Symmetry: C4
Subunit: 244 residues, 4 copies
């Protein structure tokens, strides 16, 4: 719907998705660099990734929904929450933002700590198929947490949606870092991979794992656990971007 697409609100929602992924990728990779004076602990990395998401969802969430992740965007598309063009523009803004975020870190990081710019890397003792099942589970819990925390029909105390979602990213890293350095986000993986021109043969896992994981969470959440009562034409209106 070009009337939804050519709006001021839509322009600033696409911009917020660009800026949030820029910041997220900046803080995340910068925390996991191989700083020689003190090599970062898994705890430090899990916390920086989680607190960045938690802060950006709190600050830019009222502007665009604060997806900051192509897997979550595509899951919301599948789960009939956003339009087709919102998904296209958000994903492209997230990928552009991740590249810019990694590029800014590349420019300010000193040579002795920059290394491979914290690109995701599959553990030598784990296979692509093994790692793919892990990324699916890391992203599934994250998406499920997001959908329950942002659902307007929830009546029980929601607490802090932003911090709940943020600490779900921290949780994902406390296991995921051992398998693939933890991605949960195709853009977070693509970002440094473009700046360093370093795409491993396992790069596909970092896209498929999170997308399948979030899509399975959206199917379970929006269609099996808490479905809404919308007519066939109301569901296509949401895809087209002309709903209410």
């Amino acid at each position: 719907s070009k009337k939804e697409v050519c709006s001021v609100a839509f322009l600033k929602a696409v911009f917020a998705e660009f800026l949030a992924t820029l910041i997220f990728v900046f803080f995340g990779l910068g925390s996991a660099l191989k700083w020689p004076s003190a090599l970062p602990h898994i705890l430090q990395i899990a916390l920086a990734f989680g607190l960045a998401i938690g802060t950006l969802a709190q600050a830019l969430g009222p502007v665009s929904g604060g997806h900051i992740n192509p897997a979550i965007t595509l899951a919301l598309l599948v789960g009939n929450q956003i339009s087709l063009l919102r998904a296209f523009f958000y994903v492209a803004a997230q990928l552009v933002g991740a590249i810019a975020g990694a590029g800014i870190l590349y420019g300010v990081a000193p040579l002795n700590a920059r290394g491979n710019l914290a690109v995701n890397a599959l553990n030598n003792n784990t296979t692509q198929g093994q790692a793919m099942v892990v990324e699916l589970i890391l992203t599934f819990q994250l998406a499920l947490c997001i959908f329950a925390s942002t659902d307007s029909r929830r009546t029980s105390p929601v607490g802090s949606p932003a911090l709940s979602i943020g600490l779900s990213v921290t949780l994902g890293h406390l296991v995921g870092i051992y398998f693939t350095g933890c991605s949960m986000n195709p853009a977070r993986s693509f970002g440094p991979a473009v700046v360093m021109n370093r795409f491993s043969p396992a790069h596909w896992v970092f896209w498929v794992g999170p997308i399948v994981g979030a899509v399975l969470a959206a199917i379970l959440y929006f269609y099996l656990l808490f479905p809404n009562s919308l007519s066939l034409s109301e569901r296509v209106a949401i895809i087209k971007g002309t709903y209410e």
Copy 2:
């Protein structure tokens, strides 16, 4: 009650308790595996067990109550909050879930990190009886925090029920790892024990300790501190699953 059991909503609750226990033990055991490149810190593990519950309570709490622990479900039955059949199906789903969680983790962990699959284990310098009193206290504070945070009659600012409950699991880990590897949940102990075919002689401590501790918190909470004005006919109807 055949009306309570043969309900689509009860089937969703049983599946959610299965799914959340599956995801819980996956992350919990996954975080405490003896990873060669970096041996998990105590703070790291305590935070992973705590945030896994914190996330699952936020996500699947609306579906089933977010029990995820046979000891909490038994305390809720003895505290007259749930039916006998709900308690029965819940414990079953949690046990099967814990097994399924440990097995998925088994299929993905690399050989050099698998080890015991994070089974609970008494400290060599502590006795079975000493472990039991520790497990009772660890699970007593967790159940108290749950009962207080989910009480519909609470007029005090509750904050985040999921994060308080989750950080109460982190608290019990900061003390209980040194004694038994921290259980506070019979399903967390049974899960890896079944998958690895490894049961310690102190395995009973991992069932009795948390169950006694949670039941003592239910009697103190629901019968001594904050009782309801309920008649014999209403109390019996809660057990039979026929109440309102």
Copy 3:
């Protein structure tokens, strides 16, 4: 007031303070013991002292107020919030709870980990006067947090009072552990000193500092920053325990 002190609600409040200080001291000390398998990091101890208070304030706070500290009790008394008899019984229940918690820990901790049972020891390079001004600042920030977070006239979003209060205890340990092992609570120091029967020549700092620190926060909060429109008779009615 015989009408207030002989009541069932008052009996439950005193018990809650004993039980909360029992659990707080058991968790607090048990996290700081010199465990041979892995000596607890400062961040492990700050988080365990902080999460125990946060969890206990959430669980038992609606029963008694979740004082769990003699210094906070006396600050609420001077600030004209609680009665003189309420303060005496709270302080006595807190002192006995701290002794009981320490004793339960003593009989459960193994011989090689038990040691001095996490008693407050002053740093060999800081004078008693330096440690007292530090304990003044430590408890002052905590008390101000408790007052602002539990004021019923507060219109600003309070978030989670329990977690804010508990994370304040964590902050206090990140500075205070270095100076005195961190007290901010006379009963926390009293507890293990009575079980181990070992009182330092600076134990008075652990009473003077916290009390004076909480007291100055009560004078500043309740009389300078946000005073109430209460007549002199209403003030004595509060101390006597006859007010509303």
Copy 4:
């Protein structure tokens, strides 16, 4: 507006800014001192700086706004939220408070921990230009978090504004400590520099960085993302402290 300044409410607000900055700087620098018994880990320092802000915004926020940072005060001025004289008196009190807080720490810290009193220090492999871009980004995300969390127009669950803001400070520290020891606040840097009469050649970075970074966040938030429908005349009444 001399009547805005000559008000008991303004007297309490300026005192709160002073006291909050005194406490923030004492706790922050104290957590980063080179304590020989155990040298502080990055995770300890980041948490202490963050939890001091979270705690102080929770307690003194209702009194003055809980700015505690000259870059945030100046950013709110540009964003048309505070008067010119409120900005003047807040900044003045923050610098005075930072010096007092650093000076109090000097008076209580043992000689083996004192060192440089945890002043900011440029990493030798980072240029003043690189570290300036870092300080910009660190403070930019913190300001956006504050503006989105304190906006009275927010319809989405804010959760805990204080904890969200505080954990954004921890987040900034998880990256910035490697570049500059993390400033994000001109008063934080000014305090121990004045007390130790030690001003490195890159002290300007710890002013320009945070100020520009927070000012860009204030321009983006109040003028581009969420502008108010006010008239130029009402806008100058805000600058002059006469509006509502």
